[PDB]
Structures are given as structure tokens and as C-alpha cells.
Write a protein that binds this ligand. Structure first.
Ligand SMILES: NC(=O)C1=CN([C@@H]2O[C@H](COP(=O)(O)OP(=O)(O)OC[C@H]3O[C@@H](n4cnc5c(N)ncnc54)[C@H](OP(=O)(O)O)[C@@H]3O)[C@@H](O)[C@H]2O)C=CC1
Ligand SMILES: NC(=O)C1=CN([C@@H]2O[C@H](COP(=O)(O)OP(=O)(O)OC[C@H]3O[C@@H](n4cnc5c(N)ncnc54)[C@H](OP(=O)(O)O)[C@@H]3O)[C@@H](O)[C@H]2O)C=CC1
Ligand SMILES: O=CN(O)CCCP(=O)(O)O
Ligand SMILES: O=CN(O)CCCP(=O)(O)O
Ligand SMILES: [Ca+2]
Ligand SMILES: [Ca+2]
Ligand SMILES: [Mg+2]
Ligand SMILES: [Mg+2]
Lengths: 410, 410
């Protein structure tokens, strides 16, 4: 039985993880949910605690710790270890009774739990792409220290790539490891995207888009941050850099394709030019389940893909004029150093400004571009404690710079 | 280096095999063409002999054997072993210098070289689907005796399936073995078909189609027999039975899907419901190459798949009323025993009759249907020699029965 912790259990990823775990457990007891960790959602965490009865409960926001302990007392035949903040998160990661950890915490904040899970040689089912984008080089370093840890990608495109690969070769390397793509005979990656809600808008129409309309994603139901990112295709931009770090694929070998039906989740071209792709309905349960079962697969009762009913699959190039965020991500990635950290941080600020109706669509990339331009390359610290400190400092600088740029205009 | 023999070297597969061997060798020298074997095409065998200079040459037709020896003398500094008929084939198969054999001989005839390559524990790169259809359970028995022999599928759809699997699971088993699909966690196969040239025709129009028009395949350039099979979709019916044998997939788990673009070559649904597909332009060089490099891949200079340019991929259910050969194949496969032998034999006759303008489109399925109904279940011989004799007897019986039915109607 696979012992799992779910970090960000009450969010979009975390709810889907519990969904597929529940359905798989119907027949055979395959997963034991040992731990659940949220920020503030006490009532929803208690409802999940009632169903899954995990050994550990943890809430990041200490102000709702008492509320949680109180609700939980109403559950019969149950004495969980109820924990708090970073200290709680670190205690969960250090537990011998947890094998795999799903990271469904959003934004840069997800990096902390990712780091600690790795330091405790856990299997990390990583949905949080921001951590790879802001700290890819650091994570590679960390994984070469903690040799029994692994990152297994949960992001659907990266799970798709992972699945298309031959496990006979995947097993001889590790995500983030040097030469991953060489060992796997990868020539290039087609990173598939729904294209978001604004794919058919003209330049003049785009100028005027609002966050209410950005939140109406045509294919995926997700948290607010990634949903806004999908509308600007900054999501895809972050995923380009994520592809580079996870799979050691050169930036010139990663191609973004708009596939509006979202059935094909990504494709791998091998050195012989044969292409392999993974397909399913747009549904995070598959990539989540795969991260927890890899290198095996288990039976589900999910709806089978009906190719005949789907009928048509379409593909086109994205316009970099209409979606300049993609261009900025490639540029930041190609530059290397801490440019991805600065990209991620400034986007977190610009994404949230747009969400809250403070700026326009094209201001998002304008703010990001300006922060990237302002940043000066830094010497990369050789030890991991120093490097994490350096990452946090640059991430914090970039966020303040973005806000400063916003403050100067509006 | 990889030591390869090409059986049926002057046909469509054989030429494509030499083509990709030649072009890959230009990048890096990995293939040594050790033997070529044809039926009657003395002059083109001679011409190939000059370019590749194989150690062995064989021609099945004894009446052009001396003519071949005459022609080959013209090649300076070249002393090959020149052979003929069944004897020469067996000598090539038994040679310790040959590792892999591409079987590109057409029809039931392909069985003889397939079975002897297996008997000699070779890697059999098998394109000839007729051998599997008529002798599937016998080849199964033979591969259980000769444990180092392997069939690696070359048929594009079956190569596609094979490319989608994880080789750490494949290497625990092999093609044409019981439990292959269970070991690989395969739930279901989507077998893709171009649909052939008659996909948009009414029942009334189909009654009057000719072989001249049937030979104008929209997507694949092939030999005459398979091309006619593609027009009636009997090719796909044979491929259903081929899938069942190679991968041990139940007939109720094989779906035929019409995919006119012929970019997706087939898809594998795993037990978690994830689907993996292999994709390329309709070009037999990829499946041929993979059969010779498995479990690795090598660099090629083939044109890369451009999904944006392709733009649209379509999928729909085939019409069974318009393509009754599909139904017949399913029925024969489900019956098991020697019904697939009978299906294959009667089709070889009916296919040839239609090719030479002797019968109409729906007479093909009528003849096969009538031969299948004529046949009665026969006890399966225990020893392999008697089972092989039995397959020959039945095959020969079914050809004669199909000819008799034609002769009474004419
Ligand atoms: N949703 C999706 O389909 C996909 C998501 N992703 C990635 O997965 C990650 C999560 O996304 P998504 O599920 O959409 O986001 P949500 O906003 O829906 O969920 C975020 C979760 O993280 C929790 N959380 C936030 N801060 C902390 C913290 N400090 N400590 C513990 N828990 C915390 C939240 O708890 P609380 O409820 O208490 O606020 C919530 O449970 C993102 O990084 C995203 O990029 C990637 C691909 C697809
Ligand atoms: N063509 C294709 O793209 C595909 C083909 N297939 C399968 O591959 C097989 C070959 O098809 P294809 O290449 O189109 O057929 P072709 O008719 O083009 O070629 C047949 C080849 O087999 C040779 N041959 C026939 N009998 C003998 C024999 N007694 N001994 C030695 N050689 C013999 C012929 O020799 P000769 O030239 O002297 O007559 C010829 O070279 C078929 O079984 C088909 O089902 C499967 C998938 C795709
Ligand atoms: O993996 C899932 N996502 O990242 C959401 C995909 C949305 P997009 O293709 O529109 O970015
Ligand atoms: O593998 C290649 N073929 O079998 C030829 C495919 C022809 P079809 O898709 O029309 O059956
Ligand atoms: Ca795989
Ligand atoms: Ca500067
Ligand atoms: Mg994604
Ligand atoms: Mg085929």
C-alpha cells in the first residue's frame, strides 16, 4: 500500500488527487492517505479528514489552528496529530510512514515543501510548476545530494511527456538529471496548449479583456492563478522552462502548439523522427494517478476516451504578438541564471494585479519585460543553503520591482 | 553493427527497408546487409546485389537461378554464396552471421521463411501479416520452443502499438505470447485505418467499383495485394486478427477507427484509461527501422512531423455494411480454430479475382463468407509438424473452395 501526503488538499489539484485516490480504493486498498496540509480552509479540510482519516493534519495559517482542533473533536474513533505551519510541514516530510507527496500548493510558496520533501528522500508528485521555474538549478543540485528522492511530474503536459517515454530508459535516469533527454533519445517536444479563452481575439479585442472573462477557461477547471496564466499563455511559458529543467531539453527543441480540443496533452519526437503522444480528456486525475503509480499503472473506472465522438483534433502555431508572455519565458529561459526566478516573481505580481482589475492584458507582459530588463545576472552560489537564500532574495526583489513599476504608472 | 537479411527485397517493404538502411548508414555505419532473397525478380536482385554486396543471394524460382549466377559474375571483386528455393532460404536463416531478418514476402508464402527464422532463434522483423493470420497459434507454439526467437512487428499499426509500450514490461514477455497485454497493462487498442479509396461511396457505387480505382490508394504506396485489401478494408480485418495474436488482446477490446490523414498509426488504452499513440507521415521506413533497432532508437534524416502544417486529424467509425470484410474477420477471429486460416486463403483468391476484373466488390465478401460457412471446426494437432501440415491442408482446401464458388457463379 502506497502511503501518500497531499499538500494543498483543498485546492483544485488536491481535490482531484483525493478524487482519484477514492475511486481507486473502492476495489483494492492501494493508497493510504497519511497526511493532509492546507493554508486556511478549515471547514473543507475537516470534511476531508472525516472521509480519509489521515494520521496527520496540518494547517499553515496558525490563526485557524484552534478552529481545526475543535471541528476534528466531533469525529468519532479518530485521534490525528494536528500540526501547524512550516514546523508541521517539516514534521510530515520527515515521517518514515510517508512514501510519496503530492505538491498541489500554488506559486513560489510551493517551493518550501518541495525542498523539504526532497531533503527527506521522498517521491515528490509535483504539480507546482513555479518551484521548478524559480529554482530548477537548485532542485537539480538538491536531487544529486538526496539520491533516493525523485520529482515525478504532475503537470499534464509533463506527465504526458513522461508517459510517452520508454520506462526502460526513464528508470536509468531521473527528472532534472543531466543527460535525461539524451538517454531517452528525445529530439524535440511539442508542448500542447488549449490556447485559453482568448485564442481567437484580435489585437484590438485583446487590449480590452477582463479578468472575469479570463477566468472562463474553455477546457480546464482550476485555481485562479493558473487560470489567469492560461489566458495570457504565461502558463505555457512557465511550462517551456519546466520542460527544459525536468527533461534537459534545449529551448530550441521545445515547440508550443495550440491544440484547442485538449485531447493530446503533449508529444515527444524521438531521434528517428517517430513521434509519441499521450491523450485523454482534459482531466488532472490521470496525470495525478500516474505520478503515484509510476512505473506501474493501476485500473481505474474513468470514462474511456471515445475518439470517434471527439471526431476532430486541431493544431496551430501560437501568435507571439497576441501572447507575448510566451516570448518572455523563452528569453528568460535562454538567458538562464536567475532570469526564470525573476520571470516567475514578476508574473505572480502582474497576474494578481490583472485578476484584481488593476491593470490591462498587455500591461502584464509590459511589467514582466521591464523587471527582466532591470535584473542583473548574479554569481550563482555553489552551496545549497546560500543558493536558496539567493533565490528568495531575487524572488523578493522582483516582486517589489514589479509592484514599484505598477505604483509608478497607476 | 546490426547484421540483417531482407526477404522479399525487391517488393515495397524490401525496397523501403534498403532505403532506410542506406540513409541511416550515411549518418553512421550500423547496418550490414548480409542477404537478399526474392521470388522471380532476377534483374532487380542483381542490381541490389551490386549496391549492397551481401554475402548471400537467393532466388526462389529455380528456373532463373542460373541466369542470376550469370548476371552476378559482372560484379568485380565479389564472391557471394548464390542459392535457390526453400533450401537456400533455410541456409540463410541458419547462418550465425545473421541477427535480424526482415520478412517482406507477401501472402501465406511468407509463413515458410517466418517459421524457419523462428526455428533458428532470430529476431524476425515481420511485415507479412498473412503468416500471423493463418498460423497465429502455431507461431505461438513455435516461439515457446525457440525461446530466443522474437517477432518484432513491422506492420505500421502494430509497430505503433509496440512503440507506445514500456520496454521494461515488454522485455518480461514477447510478441505472440499469452498474457502479453496483461503484462503491459493494455486495456484496449484503437486500430487506425486510412479507410482506403472508397470511404465516401454509397452501397450502389460500391457495387460497381473496379480494381483500377481500388489500386489508387490515397496515402500508402504498396504492393497490389495489400492495396486491394485496403480498398475492401480486409487489410484492417486481417490486422484485427494480427493484433489479437501479437498482443493477446481480446477481440472485444479491438476497435477499428477510420483516420483519413494517416498520421496517428494506432493508439493503446491502458488500464488507467490513459491512451498513448504513435504518429508520423504514412511511411513504412519508421516501422521498419524500429523493428531493426528495438529496444533502442537511432538518428535519421527523415522529414520531421509538422503538426501545425498537418493542421487537422479526423476519426470516425467504419461502416460495416459498406465494408463487410471487417465483420467477416471479426467473426473468423472469434471462432478461432482454423477459421482465420480459411479467412486468409479465401481472401487471397477473392482479392486476386477482383484484381483481374473477374468479380465485383461485394462478391469478395460473398465468396469469403461462403467459404467460412463451408468450413467445419477441426481438432488441433498436438505436434508442430502435423499442425503445420494441417494449416497447409486447410489453406489449400479454402483456396480451392473459393475458386469453386467463383466457377459456379461464372
Ligand atoms: N489546477 C490544475 O488543474 C493544475 C494546477 N497546476 C499547479 O498546481 C498548483 C496548485 O494549483 P491549483 O490546485 O490550481 O491551486 P488552488 O488555488 O486551487 O489550490 C491551492 C492549494 O494550496 C494550498 N496552499 C496555499 N498556500 C499554502 C501554504 N502556505 N501551506 C499549505 N497549503 C497552502 C491552498 O489551501 P487553502 O484552501 O487553505 O487556501 C489550496 O489547498 C499550482 O502550482 C499550479 O500551477 C498544474 C497543472 C494543472
Ligand atoms: N507494402 C507495405 O507498405 C506493407 C506491407 N505489409 C505486408 O508486407 C508483405 C509484403 O508486401 P509488399 O511489399 O507490398 O508486397 P510486394 O508484392 O510489393 O513484394 C513482395 C516481395 O516478396 C517476394 N516474394 C514472393 N514470394 C517469394 C518467395 N517464394 N521467396 C522469396 N521472395 C518472395 C517478391 O519477390 P519478386 O520481386 O521476385 O516477385 C517481392 O519482392 C505483405 O505480406 C503485406 O501484408 C504490411 C504493412 C505495409
Ligand atoms: O496541465 C494543465 N494545465 O497546465 C492547464 C492547461 C491549460 P493551457 O493549455 O490553456 O495552458
Ligand atoms: O501498415 C500499413 N498498412 O497496413 C497500409 C495501411 C492501409 P489502410 O490504413 O488503408 O488499411
Ligand atoms: Ca511510457
Ligand atoms: Ca542592467
Ligand atoms: Mg500544464
Ligand atoms: Mg498495416
Amino acid at each position: 500500500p502506497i502511503n501518500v501526503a497531499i499538500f494543498g488538499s483543498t485546492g483544485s489539484i488536491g481535490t482531484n488527487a483525493l478524487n482519484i485516490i477514492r475511486e481507486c480504493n473502492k476495489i483494492e486498498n492501494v493508497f493510504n492517505v497519511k497526511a493532509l496540509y492546507v493554508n486556511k480552509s478549515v471547514n473543507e479540510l475537516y470534511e476531508q479528514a472525516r472521509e480519509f482519516l489521515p494520521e496527520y493534519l496540518c494547517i499553515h495559517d496558525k490563526s485557524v489552528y484552534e478552529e481545526l482542533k475543535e471541528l476534528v473533536k466531533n469525529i468519532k474513533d479518530y485521534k490525528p496529530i494536528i500540526l501547524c505551519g512550516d514546523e508541521g510541514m517539516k514534521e510530515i516530510c520527515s515521517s518514515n510512514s510517508i512514501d510519496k507527496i503530492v505538491i498541489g500548493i500554488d506559486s513560489f510558496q510551493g517551493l518550501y515543501s518541495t525542498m523539504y520533501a526532497i531533503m527527506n528522500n521522498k517521491i515528490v508528485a509535483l504539480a507546482n510548476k513555479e518551484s521548478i521555474v524559480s529554482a530548477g538549478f537548485f532542485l537539480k543540485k538538491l536531487l544529486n545530494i538526496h539520491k533516493n528522492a525523485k520529482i515525478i511530474p504532475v503537470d499534464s503536459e509533463h506527465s504526458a511527456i513522461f508517459q510517452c517515454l520508454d520506462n526502460n530508459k526513464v528508470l536509468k535516469t531521473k527528472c532534472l538529471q543531466d543527460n535525461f533527454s539524451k538517454i531517452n533519445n528525445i529530439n524535440k517536444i511539442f508542448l500542447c496548449s488549449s490556447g485559453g479563452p482568448f485564442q481567437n481575439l484580435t489585437m484590438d479585442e485583446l487590449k480590452n479583456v477582463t479578468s472575469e472573462n479570463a477566468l472562463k477557461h474553455p477546457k480546464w477547471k482550476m485555481g485562479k492563478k493558473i487560470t489567469i496564466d492560461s489566458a495570457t499563455m504565461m502558463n505555457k511559458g512557465l511550462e517551456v522552462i519546466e520542460t527544459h529543467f525536468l527533461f534537459d531539453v534545449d529551448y530550441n527543441d521545445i515547440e508550443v502548439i495550440v491544440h484547442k480540443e485538449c485531447i493530446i496533452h503533449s508529444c515527444v519526437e524521438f531521434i528517428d523522427k517517430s513521434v509519441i503522444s499521450q491523450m485523454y480528456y482534459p482531466d488532472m486525475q490521470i496525470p495525478i494517478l500516474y505520478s503515484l503509480t509510476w512505473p506501474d499503472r493501476i485500473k481505474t473506472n474513468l470514462k474511456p476516451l471515445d475518439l470517434a465522438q471527439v471526431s476532430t483534433l486541431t493544431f496551430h502555431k501560437p501568435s507571439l504578438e497576441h501572447f507575448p508572455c510566451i516570448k518572455l519565458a523563452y528569453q528568460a529561459g535562454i538567458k538562464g541564471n536567475f532570469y526564470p526566478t525573476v520571470l516567475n516573481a514578476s508574473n505572480e505580481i502582474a497576474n494578481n494585479l490583472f485578476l484584481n482589475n488593476k491593470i490591462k492584458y498587455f500591461d502584464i507582459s509590459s511589467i514582466i519585460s521591464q523587471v527582466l530588463e532591470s535584473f542583473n545576472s548574479q554569481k550563482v552560489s555553489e552551496n545549497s543553503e546560500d543558493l536558496m537564500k539567493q533565490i528568495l532574495q531575487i524572488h523578493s526583489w522582483a516582486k517589489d520591482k514589479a509592484t514599484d513599476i505598477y505604483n509608478k504608472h497607476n
